Assembly symmetry: C3
Homo-oligomer: 138 residues x 3
């Protein structure tokens, strides 16, 4: 009887960061991360596209309540990340390298705590227009 | 065997609509759809990406000729939807809620009435730059 | 915990081409390819998104070092294609129609000559903003 669909919302946030691993030497960190290892940091206007999936509810015509998704993304992404320094203001990145990959995983994990089981499909993070990460929970 | 590929074409159309259900009351439609339930409607420049798939023809190099795909899209999307009020001018939406999910399904179904069997892979609809639905016939 | 992810990089290149098949007469070529068959050619600012996948490395927080990806893409896409006439300057297209489908396959194949095994996931080519091909090695 029924249709599955994927629904996405895009938002952006501003954050600064520095790429470095506490396990590596200062020289190793420079060789590996180059300009991204700048000691005082750099920054991005991150874009995040969150995709959920499920059945199109025949009564409402939606996979998910859109207000709820706004609230969920506001709580899981904007509040903790927006206008923040990832490595100093977000406790999770005290011991985790703030690569775009790890930002995608962090966002996924934050969303899975609010969202109904089985509904989250994909998190996509643009560090810049040209550099993208997609995480699907695999 | 020969290579298989996905080929897409993007178009846009302008339409107005209003989100409301026949099954819910005035109070309930307002709580669920909020500003989208505005009695006199609102509107969008919808963007649609239609993807087809198949073998790359070894003599012509094409999965599908883009001039054909433009004609199918003109018949299945532009003629019925462009510069229209969805809820009043498109009979299908007389008793279906015009959410972006249901628009993606409507376009899929129209395309299938018009296209050769087995070629459609995906229909993606942007209601705005930030709100997207993907339907893959599942 | 190991986490797989997709990582993409986008670049562009300028090239000219002409669409025609040695298996068609001039009339047929003109009928099939229309304005794309213009004898002196036409051109595009092609955009390419290359997507790799794999495990997020716990030490570096990356699936793949960007520097490498950029090198591979420079060698597989920019050097052979950028500011070129596809049909006259790229030997591969001497006997292959330079459709966007065949450009995606060509890029895929070039990339596989230099990427490690099991890393290449997707090649996406935009011939224009509105005409896209995706190839996944199928
Ligand atoms: Mg259907
Ligand atoms: Ni950065
Ligand atoms: Ni609307
Ligand atoms: Ni062309």
């Amino acid at each position: 009887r029924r249709c599955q669909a994927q629904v996405s919302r895009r938002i952006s946030f501003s954050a600064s960061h520095r790429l470095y691993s506490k396990f590596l030497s200062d020289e190793e960190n420079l060789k590996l991360f180059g300009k991204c290892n700048n000691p005082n940091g750099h920054g991005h206007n991150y874009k995040v596209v969150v995709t959920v999936h499920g059945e199109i509810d025949p009564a409402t015509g939606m996979v998910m309540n859109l207000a709820d998704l706004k609230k969920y993304m506001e709580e899981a992404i904007m509040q903790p990340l927006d206008h923040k320094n990832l490595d100093m203001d977000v406790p999770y990145f005290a011991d985790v390298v703030s690569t775009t990959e790890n930002v995608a995983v962090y966002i996924w994990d934050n969303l899975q705590k609010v969202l109904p089981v089985g509904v989250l499909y994909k998190v996509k993070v643009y560090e810049t227009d040209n550099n993208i990460v997609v995480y699907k929970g695999e």
